[PDB]
Structure formats: structure tokens, C-alpha cells
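PROTOCOL LOG
Step 1. Enter all chains and additional molecules of the complex.
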Amino acid sequence: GDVTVILNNLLEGYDNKLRPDIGVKPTLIHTDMYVNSIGPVNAINMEYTIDIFFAQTWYDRRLKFNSTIKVLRLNSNM
Amino acid sequence: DNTTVFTRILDRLLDGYDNRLRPGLGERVTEVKTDIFVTSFGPVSDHDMEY
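Step 2. Run joint prediction.
Step 3. Record the structure below.
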């Protein structure tokens, strides 16, 4: 209901071609890695396989809202 | 001309519908009932430890 309103307000007038803080300061990104498995290591091709969950977190002051909802839990749609 | 009435039904279903929100987001937990029918249990690959 009102999560739709929050989402529509967040994206209205929003440019995803521009990183947050485009001309102010570098965007700081904190990264986490969960390693599901480190696959076979074939020396023939000098390569190895790895399966991970790759987490990235950063601040976007354009994605700032005020509501009783504290976190928006979304899928890949957005 | 069932086409127009059914087109209206679908359009009304998708009007004001937000697919970024799971059903019952506000006041419920979405319960998904799952079921698998295996049409073929493929070959098992020992070398890759997979099937």
C-alpha cells in the first residue's frame, strides 16, 4: 500500500547513470564475501572455480525515506 | 465477443498492481506450496560430483 508510495517517491526524478555523491566525494563501498565452495583447481588451464555470495553496501542519500518501515526488503526487480 | 470482457478482467487485475511487493507484505507471511515432478533423473557425473 504505502510501500508502493515510498518506492515510487524514491525512484521519481532519480538518475541511475550518476553515482551517489557524483561531484562531492568518492563513494565508499563495504564488501563481504561468503564462499560457498572453492571448486576444482585444474593446472592445465591454470584456473580455479569458486562459488560465492557477494555483498556490497553503500550510502545513497537519494534512497532516503521516512516511514514506520525501517528497511525495504526487495528482490531483483528494483 | 469474450475477448473484450476477458481483456478487461486482465487489465483490472494488473491495474494498480505492484510486483515488487510480495502478497500480504503488511500483515502476513507468504506461504508457497511447492511440488516437484521429475521427468528424468539425468546421468550422474562422478568426475564433477554432480547429477
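Step 4. Note key features.
The interface with chain A takes residues 18-21, 25-26 of chain B (CB under 8 Å).
Chain B has one helix and no strands.
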